[PDB]
Design a protein around this nucleic acid. Structure first.
Ligand SMILES: [Mg+2]
Ligand SMILES: [Zn+2]
Ligand SMILES: [Zn+2]
Ligand SMILES: [Zn+2]
Lengths: 114, 264, 141, 158, 86, 133, 43, 65, 559, 160, 196
RNA sequence: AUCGAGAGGA
């Protein structure tokens, strides 16, 4: 009855942007990005790959409510470093890892005979 | 051999594949498992219209069961979401229409299987919507039993969906995840009355990892990079395609984030 | 035949009963610690023996599993809750026109049953589902 | 010695010790005359009624007697310097804070004490659930309704 | 009964705004805001009547007088500005 | 910007206080016997075996948001095999010309009584503890 | 259905309390909770 | 009323198994659990779907209308 | 009684309630459906006019919308069925009945209205699913639980009424309770056990977990605390992460049992300026008790800060508890073998003592204490024997139970359970009592037909040697059923009697209000107390302070 | 009974004292007995205390018994709330039951009485009375629907 | 609710991935709070978990008949033979993170019953609506679109706070407001008013 | 509209 429609978990809406970026108040070089229509799956990986990088000081993902599908990623980086750049570098590294693993597992399956 | 994560497969079959993930962070492993369970798309029945029903089962029960029935979804890439198509309700390229009619002619109970199911719309060269049957006899998954004098006639429209919307679009049944077989990293603290080793069963995966030795200090630096996993197939998509599609869908989500960042 | 008799509440005051038939077997060590401590009956001249202790409780209580290990008020609460529990009342449900009826999609017979439950028709006509239940703290909901 | 009373002077003292970062080596700058006369001034500064007639003044003094006793116990001239280290600034700040907290603590006119008291006695009675002396809700019945006859009359001879 | 009054000097009523008069004055001021009556404080990013009333209370500019009543019949009047809020 | 106190101690006793990763250590000062300590320590990250004598120092520095260890181009504050950050809760005097210092490192507790120093470990929040082999 | 078909009702110095004589005749604890708790029993 | 399609936690298909399982325990005098293991169900959460299910469908069929 | 004093009222709601940890204590989880039906009348002003017009454009079916409009003449305009709903132009002074919107005041009530704490007003938060939602810490004043309980909600209709609810009936104000002079709300259930588990010195958080937990705090500044451990890894203490939530300038001291400043047991608490020095958090520090942190923060800073603190503590602790895990199990109720054997030997010793007392009773040698029947003395002595035996076996078991035991940790936090629960589960459930007596000879000289006549013994009188885990015998089962029936009838009768008593008390004390001259008087003018409470002060601002002059000798007094 | 009493040095120390308990109360003769302390004797029945020692002593004993009831459960209520009820009973003549017998028969307004038990009899007797309800009572104003003289409506708000 | 007196109501519904998972991948359909158990002392709930797991593995039925001599240690021995922890505790992994949970978690098969209290059937809201003729007050019940009752107890609880105007609007304007003409010389409402 | 019955909560 009162339940939200299931497609609202993975579908964007009107007037909704996938990423919204707002600087942190009383914080230097810090910004919170509101990922919308996305969940834990993206956030934990993004935060971990940010944590691997040295230049970024702070990286955290918060889920505002289990009801809705959104999460906030706060990133704070070195002076002279765009936090968006750090996010992009982490994303590209993730993608490279994914492709490498996909090709390696494909060759492994071709080796497999059953 | 490519720089980065390495995979070695223990055993293979059409249903299950067991493999050892190597040189990875754990966050992407659990994220990939989430994507595999939910995110990767599948074709399944999303609409049913019942012209005639005389079965003791009510129509809603049947619609739920039909939504659960497994259908082939390997060529789902050529198929497009019914919401992304330009059709009014259902296009041949966006939906697959399948009709079922059965009469209990036999005085003995006439059961109904997933095999007894016809396809109406054009396949258009695709391998989509074939009702998958793993039964040794070849008969489908049982749906109903019809007494003599009973018939059931209905039409189903099957569309693409994500397991997030409904569990029917689910590509895998059981996922097996393990690490720290020796619990050297001590990520969990065992509960014991007398002794943890005697009370807690030893895992199989323990064999492949080097045993720990008492008298060695706890390794602070060590972080989990070796993982053991096993993947099962509902059969709607083969196992290898299921996992590689999980990888690809996760990459696509990352790429869409990147695209939105570029747009801003 | 006289091997069994009907006992009124008045007549009970003249008779002496043993819970277990094995009480009448001659008495004579080692015993497993977990098994329940039962009093050596220390009494003779038993007139009768009870059919089985599980008969003293009623129909709703016979559904409750291991009620001997649970608190009695909670057994009462469950005995009240089975009436509100949903189930398939009879197979003629589809034919009958009741003012209100409710029926489970996939009824399942309990994995652990009382023996008396056999004569209660619960395994044949169950009213619950056997769910994988975890006791843990997750997200505090 | 433990009893319910307003203002919680101990917490104010701890707040003063942390806030001003008082250092134990230095001696106090407090005047003895000022300490005692300021305690007396603070006693004069706490009010519950403001009428200018003798019976109301006496009522105010007797109504704040116990709190004044606590004030004198908490602010002793030996204790103010020896037990904890204090400065004139912190002493005056504590005096004003005690005054303000006591003034805030006074009942606002218009509050229905009767309904609140009735609820506050009723609620734990609902919680009561379970020796030759009556106890519990039946005892409360005996107390509440004038009982010409008691179920457990008794007396204690000393 | 006749010309019941209390002289302003030496009044013993508490010089504090008890929760009830603050609440009633805030509610009446919010009612005034919702009625589109003139407002005598400058507003900065405010639309709600209640927060406007709170700010007016802080500025101590509300032309109302709380009438304290004594059981004998004599009444005391205390203007908002004379009254204080802790 | 320098050390407040330095000494070498020997552990009289190690006590597992119902903790699996933390033990309370009791240590006596070598040379002068007027001073000694007892500190809660994490034995899992540094084994504190009995009959082992350990070096102890306390430093004021080397607020500001914490930053990683970074490349290590910044010099170590100490090559010592243990370091903690903490704040002192109470300074006490056991006897005339004899002082006692009570410190707490995020819940761990240190107690060190000695007489020799009276110009160090003042009532300020900042403090660091370094412990070599 | 069964439990309703097998029901007792007692209209009205200690009735509600489970009696020793109730052993085996009446179920010990299958009773409603409410204003008529204990007066109504099950066989 | 009728055999579950899939386990609510496993998600593994169990509709095709049911008939075989029954036949297996009658023709070979099989233990229920040995039949379950032979059927390929190694997880107890999908095993519950088979072991405790009761085919209420058969009784409804007996009703002539 | 029914149509004049208390009435069915308009703008009412009621649903089943569930608990949402990520929901502020003052907020209430109003479902969307009720927000659509319930309306607040509003008058158009230049400040709100835009939004109001937009509201009516959204229509009554989608919220935020408006259901009705009122013209100056008063002829209603229905948004649901009217052709003008699209082209309306609203002039000033007209009324719009807007839908219930977020950050609005509404009364929230539980059906037993035994407290003014039961009728406090909450802020509105609109939520998708159907259940009324609320904070775990607001359950205590209501006594509500999520077993299907239903609660009610009321919507004010005028600005002044909203002000009364916001400034008199706000939840943060009712935190300090006029009865018992202690806060009535506190950290409860999962949050309490999690806070205990986190504050342990054994448990240390790591950098990644620390960063996530730090971000979870809403008003967090962004300064990263210095790590507690620095050499092998940058570890953190749970006490530091929790101190991130404690407001600056807050000091608390707590000494109990043996509390050295060294504090080897880590009992007691020292908190300075929002940082926690030593101790492990449990119910006394974090709960509703006097001197609890809620009391200190409410008195020192203000109530809104305290409610925000509720929220912060819950968020951080629930996150960490999710990542640590918790459970219960049969293994938590299983006692060690030799401990069970010693418990059984204790029971056997008690049985022998009872037997020897009965043997003395048979020989007519026992003396009669003044004012007590011989049988009375015998019964009381045997009862004391059995009670002490049960308690001693329970203490033995509890000593055997390790600190890793989950039920032990739940009792240590104070979340749920007591010593008696453990003792009944693992050692012995006790001796049954009916009408303040041992099990009665319902049959002729026999408590049960299976027992012999004229048998005064622990088993005939119903002492259950077995525990809940061990398994009760049938006779013990029936006796326990008798006792439980007495408990249930006690509830069923005491509820009615106490409701009647509360009603009479309330009807007697309606007119007791402190007048301006500070006397408490009725409507007629009669004075009850010239100064309420004899000190003229509100019971919230009253705390237990020790008077040092009373205790102690004259010599220490002088020194 | 264990007891706390000042030692000659000054500190409070424990003192064991023998004290006896009765099963029935006949107070007037009991106190006039040698070997007892009239200042220290106590009784359960507060009505006899009121008859013998006056109304204030019975007030204190009533508070003590209510306090014992509250503390038997372990609960605690601030002394003001219970003292309010004890004073309400004590302030007018003898002890007044919280029942239609005692506290409804008071001179309060008739509608505040009719809200409690025996509504119609109160209404009839009062109609024969022609007594004038002051309309001060909160129940009276609740019946009238007008804003009662609660703290919010206790003052009249006027302009400058 | 369960067969051991443990009642409950859903707070949240999570998807399968968000739930914690065992090594085998088994996801609990149902999660209940441990803190409830100690106060209730329903040990048979835990025993049912254990015996149901053992029976599911055995392919044989489990006997939960009362007063039958069965040992928890024996059932644990069986489960141990089947390669699981004797008490039944199972290692579990956090769903959101994939990290091991420090506390091993008890989860097993348990009979659970749906109850005749749905949220949707209970929920109701009034706003303005129908009024009974005799009292000019809201009709009773959700089905009649009626209004909730503001009890005299609730009235007292509101009097304690002191919101007199709120009570006036609740008990005059909300339910049964009325305007009446009265005559002083009468003292009663005998006046007839030609208002037009 | 009466009256009855059953159930929900501490
Ligand atoms: Mg409940
Ligand atoms: Zn299409
Ligand atoms: Zn399964
Ligand atoms: Zn007239």
């Amino acid at each position: 009855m009162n339940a939200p429609d299931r497609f609202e978990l993975f579908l964007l809406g009107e007037g909704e942007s996938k990423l919204k970026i707002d600087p942190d108040t009383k914080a230097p070089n810090a910004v919170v990005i509101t990922f919308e229509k996305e969940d834990h799956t993206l956030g934990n990986l993004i935060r971990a790959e940010l944590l691997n990088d040295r230049k970024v000081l702070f990286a955290a993902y918060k889920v505002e409510h289990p009801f809705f599908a959104r999460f906030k990623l706060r990133i704070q980086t070195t002076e002279g470093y765009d936090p968006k750049d750090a996010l992009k570098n982490a994303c590209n590294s993730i993608i490279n890892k994914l492709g490498a693993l996909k090709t390696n597992f494909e060759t492994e399956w071709n080796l497999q005979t059953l | 051999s490519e720089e980065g994560p390495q995979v070695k497969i223990r055993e293979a079959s059409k249903d299950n594949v067991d493999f050892i993930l190597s040189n990875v962070d754990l966050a992407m492993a659990n994220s990939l498992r989430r994507v595999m369970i939910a995110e990767i798309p599948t074709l399944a029945i999303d609409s049913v219209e019942v012209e005639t029903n005389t079965t003791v089962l009510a129509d809603e029960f049947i619609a739920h069961r039909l939504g659960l029935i497994p259908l082939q979804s390997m060529d789902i890439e050529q198929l497009e979401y019914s919401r992304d198509c330009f059709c009014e309700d259902h296009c041949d390229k966006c939906s697959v229409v399948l009709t079922l009619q059965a009469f209990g002619e036999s005085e003995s109970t006439t059961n109904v299987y997933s095999k007894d199911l016809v396809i109406v719309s054009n396949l258009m060269g695709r391998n989509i919507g074939h009702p998958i049957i793993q039964d040794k006899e070849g008969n489908g998954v049982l749906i109903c039993k019809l007494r003599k004098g009973q018939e059931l006639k209905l039409t189903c429209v099957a569309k693409k969906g994500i397991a997030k919307e409904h569990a029917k679009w689910g590509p895998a049944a059981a996922i097996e995840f393990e690490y720290d077989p020796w619990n050297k990293l001590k990520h969990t603290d065992y509960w014991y009355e007398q002794d943890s080793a005697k009370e807690w069963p030893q895992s199989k995966n323990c064999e492949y990892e080097d045993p720990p030795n008492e008298g060695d200090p706890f390794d602070y630096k060590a972080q989990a990079d070796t993982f053991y996993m096993n993947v099962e197939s509902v059969g709607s998509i083969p196992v290898d395609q299921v996992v590689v599609r999980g990888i690809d869908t996760l990459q696509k989500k990352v790429a869409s984030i990147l695209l939105a960042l570029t747009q801003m | 035949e006289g091997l069994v008799e009907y006992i009124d509440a008045e007549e009970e005051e003249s008779i002496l009963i043993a819970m277990q038939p094995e009480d009448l077997e001659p008495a004579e060590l080692d015993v497993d610690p977990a098994k329940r401590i039962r009093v050596s009956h220390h009494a003779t001249t038993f007139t009768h023996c009870e059919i089985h202790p599980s008969m003293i409780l009623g129909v709703a209580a016979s559904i409750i599993p291991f009620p001997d290990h649970n608190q009695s008020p909670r057994n009462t609460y469950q005995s009240a809750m089975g009436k509100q529990a949903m189930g398939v009342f009879l197979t003629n449900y589809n034919v009958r026109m009741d003012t209100m009826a409710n029926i489970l999609y996939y009824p399942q017979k309990p994995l652990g049953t009382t023996r008396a439950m056999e004569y209660l028709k619960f395994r044949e006509l169950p009213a619950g589902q056997n769910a994988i239940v975890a006791i843990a703290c997750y997200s505090g909901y | 010695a433990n009893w319910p009373l307003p203002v919680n002077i101990r917490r104010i003292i701890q707040n003063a010790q942390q806030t001003f970062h008082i250092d134990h080596t230095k001696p106090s700058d407090l005047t003895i005359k000022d300490i005692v006369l300021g305690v007396k001034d603070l006693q004069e500064n706490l009010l519950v009624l403001r009428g200018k007639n003798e019976i109301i003044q006496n009522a105010q003094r007797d109504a704040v007697t116990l709190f004044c006793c606590l004030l004198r116990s908490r602010l002793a001239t030996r204790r103010v310097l020896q037990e904890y280290r204090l400065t004139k600034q912190a002493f005056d700040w504590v005096l004003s804070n005690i005054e303000a907290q006591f003034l805030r603590s006074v009942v606002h006119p218009g509050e229905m004490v009767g309904v609140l008291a009735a609820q506050s006695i009723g609620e734990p009675a609902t919680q009561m659930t379970l020796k030759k002396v009556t106890s519990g809700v039946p005892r409360l019945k005996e107390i509440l309704n004038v009982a010409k006859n008691m179920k457990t009359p008794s007396l204690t001879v000393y | 009964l006749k010309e019941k009054a209390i002289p302003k000097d030496q009044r013993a009523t508490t010089p504090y705004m008890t929760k009830y008069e603050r609440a009633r004055i805030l509610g009446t001021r919010a009612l005034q805001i919702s009625m589109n009556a003139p407002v005598f404080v400058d507003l900065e990013g405010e639309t709600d009547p209640l927060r406007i009333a709170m700010k007016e209370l802080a500025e101590k500019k509300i032309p109302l007088v709380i009438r304290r009543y004594l059981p004998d019949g004599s009444f005391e009047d205390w203007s908002v500005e004379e009254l204080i809020v802790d | 910007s320098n050390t407040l106190f330095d000494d070498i101690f020997q552990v009289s006793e190690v006590d597992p206080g119902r903790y699996n990763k933390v033990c309370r250590i009791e240590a006596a000062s070598t040379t002068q016997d007027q001073c000694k300590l007892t500190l809660d320590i994490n034995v899992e990250l540094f084994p504190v075996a009995a009959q082992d004598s350990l070096t102890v120092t306390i430093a004021s520095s080397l607020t500001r948001s914490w930053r990683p260890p970074q490349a290590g181009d910044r010099s170590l504050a100490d090559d010592y095999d243990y370091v903690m950050y903490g704040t002192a809760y109470k300074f006490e005097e056991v006897s005339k010309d004899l002082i006692a210092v009570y410190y707490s490192f995020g819940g761990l507790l240190m107690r060190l009584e000695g007489n020799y120093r009276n110009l160090n470990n003042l009532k300020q929040e900042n403090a660091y503890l370094l412990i070599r082999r | 259905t069964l439990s309703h078909l097998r029901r007792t009702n007692t209209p009205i110095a200690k009735p509600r309390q489970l009696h020793n004589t109730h052993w085996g005749l009446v179920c010990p604890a299958e009773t409603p909770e409410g204003q008529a708790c204990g007066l109504v029993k099950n066989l | 009323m009728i055999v579950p399609v899939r386990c609510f936690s496993c998600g593994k298909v169990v509709g095709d198994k049911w008939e075989s399982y029954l036949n297996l325990l009658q023709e070979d005098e099989l233990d229920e659990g040995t039949a379950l293991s032979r059927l390929g169900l190694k997880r107890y959460c999908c095993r519950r779907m088979i072991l405790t299910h009761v085919d209420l469908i058969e009784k409804f069929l007996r009703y002539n209308p | 009684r029914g149509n004049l004093m208390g009435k069915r009222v308009d703008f009412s709601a009621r649903t089943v309630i569930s608990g949402d940890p990520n929901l502020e204590l003052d907020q209430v989880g109003v479902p969307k459906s009720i927000a659509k039906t319930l309306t607040y009348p509003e008058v158009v002003t230049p400040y709100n006019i835009d939004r109001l017009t937009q509201l009516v454009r959204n229509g009554p079916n989608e919220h935020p919308g408006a259901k009705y409009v009122i013209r100056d003449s008063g002829d209603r305009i229905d948004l649901r069925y009217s052709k003008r709903a699209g082209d309306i132009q609203l002039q000033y002074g007209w009324k719009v009945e807007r839908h219930i919107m977020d950050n609005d005041p509404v009364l929230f009530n539980r059906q037993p209205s035994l407290h003014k704490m039961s009728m406090m007003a909450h802020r509105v938060k609109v939520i998708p699913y159907s259940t009324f939602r609320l904070n775990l810490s607001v359950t205590s004043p209501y006594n509500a639980d999520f077993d299907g309980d239903e609660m009610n909600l009321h919507v004010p209709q005028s600005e002044e009424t909203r002000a009364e609810l916001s400034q008199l009936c706000a939840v943060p104000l009712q935190i300090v309770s006029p009865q018992s002079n202690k806060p009535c709300m506190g950290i409860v259930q999962d949050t309490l056990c999690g806070i205990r588990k986190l504050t342990l010195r054994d448990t240390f958080i790591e950098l990644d977990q620390v960063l996530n937990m730090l971000y979870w705090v809403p008003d967090w500044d962004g300064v990263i605390p210095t790590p507690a451990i620095i050499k092998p890894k940058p570890l953190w203490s749970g006490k530091q992460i929790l101190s991130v939530a404690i407001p600056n300038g807050i000091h608390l001291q707590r000494f109990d049992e043996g509390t050295t400043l060294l504090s080897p047991k880590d009992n007691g608490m020292l908190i300075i300026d929002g940082q926690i020095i030593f101790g492990v958090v449990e119910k006394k520090t974090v709960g509703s008790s006097n001197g609890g942190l809620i009391h200190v923060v409410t008195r020192e800073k203000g109530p809104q800060v305290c409610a925000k603190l509720f929220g912060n503590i819950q968020k951080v602790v629930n996150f960490w508890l999710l990542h640590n895990g918790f459970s219960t199990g049969i293994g938590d109720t299983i006692a060690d073998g030799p401990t069970m054997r010693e418990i059984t030997e204790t029971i056997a010793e008690a049985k022998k003592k009872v037997l020897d007392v009965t043997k003395e009773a048979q020989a007519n040698l026992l003396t009669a204490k003044h004012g007590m029947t011989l049988r009375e003395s015998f019964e009381d002595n045997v009862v004391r024997f059995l009670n002490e035996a049960r308690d001693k076996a329970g203490r033995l078991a509890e000593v055997n139970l390790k600190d890793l035991n989950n039920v032990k940790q739940m009792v240590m936090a104070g979340s749920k359970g007591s010593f008696i629960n453990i003792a009944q589960m693992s050692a012995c459930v006790g001796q049954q009592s009916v009408e303040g007596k041992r099990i009665a000879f319902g049959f002729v000289d026999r408590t049960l037909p299976h027992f012999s006549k004229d048998d005064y013994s622990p088993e005939s009188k119903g002492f259950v040697e077995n525990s809940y885990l061990r398994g009760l015998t049938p006779q013990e089962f029936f006796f326990h059923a008798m006792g439980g029936r007495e408990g249930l009838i006690d509830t069923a009768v005491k509820t009615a009697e106490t409701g009647y008593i509360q009603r009479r008390l309330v009807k007697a004390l309606e007119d007791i209000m402190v007048h301006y001259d500070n006397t408490t008087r009725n409507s007629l003018g009669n004075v009850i107390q010239f100064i309420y409470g004899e000190d003229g002060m509100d019971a919230a601002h009253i705390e237990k302070q020790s008077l040092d002059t009373i205790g102690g000798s004259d010599a220490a007094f002088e020194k | 009974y264990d007891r706390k009493v000042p030692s000659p040095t000054g500190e409070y120390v424990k003192e064991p004292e023998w004290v006896l308990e009765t099963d029935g109360v006949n107070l007037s003769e009991v106190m006039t007995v040698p070997g007892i302390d009239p200042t220290r004797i106590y009784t359960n029945s507060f009505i006899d205390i009121m008859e013998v020692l006056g109304i204030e002593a019975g007030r204190a004993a009533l508070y003590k018994e209510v306090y014992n009831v509250i503390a038997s459960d372990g609960s605690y209520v601030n002394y003001r709330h219970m003292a309010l009820l004890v004073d309400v009973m004590t302030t007018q003549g003898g002890l007044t039951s919280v029942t239609r017998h005692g506290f409804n028969r008071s001179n309060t307004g008739a509608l505040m009485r009719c809200s409690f038990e025996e509504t119609v009899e109160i209404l009839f007797e009062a109609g024969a009375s022609a007594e004038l309800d002051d309309c001060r009572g909160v129940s009276e104003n609740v019946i009238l629907g007008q804003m009662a003289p609660i703290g919010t409506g206790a003052f009249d708000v006027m302009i400058d | 609710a369960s067969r051991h007196g443990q009642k409950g109501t859903i707070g949240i519904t999570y998807r399968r991935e968000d739930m914690p998972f065992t090594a085998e991948g088994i996801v609990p359909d149902l999660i209940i709070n441990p803190h409830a158990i100690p106060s209730r002392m329903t040990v048979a709930h835990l025993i049912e978990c254990l015996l149901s797991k053992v029976a599911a593995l055995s392919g044989n039925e489990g006997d939960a008949s009362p007063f039958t001599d069965i040992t928890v240690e024996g059932i644990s021995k069986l489960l141990r033979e089947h390669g699981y922890q004797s008490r039944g505790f199972e290692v579990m992994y956090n769903g959101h993170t994939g990290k091991k949970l420090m506390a091993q978690i008890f989860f097993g098969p348990t009979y659970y019953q749906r109850l005749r209290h749905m949220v949707d059937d209970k929920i109701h809201a009034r706003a303005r609506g129908p009024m009974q003729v005799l009292t000019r007050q809201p009709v009773e019940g959700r089905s009649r679109d009626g209004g909730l009752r503001f009890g005299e107890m609730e009235r007292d609880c509101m009097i304690a706070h002191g919101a007199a105007s709120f009570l006036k609007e609740r008990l005059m304007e909300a339910s049964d407001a009325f305007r009446v003409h009265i005559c002083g010389i009468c003292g009663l409402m005998t006046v007839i008013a030609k208002l037009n």
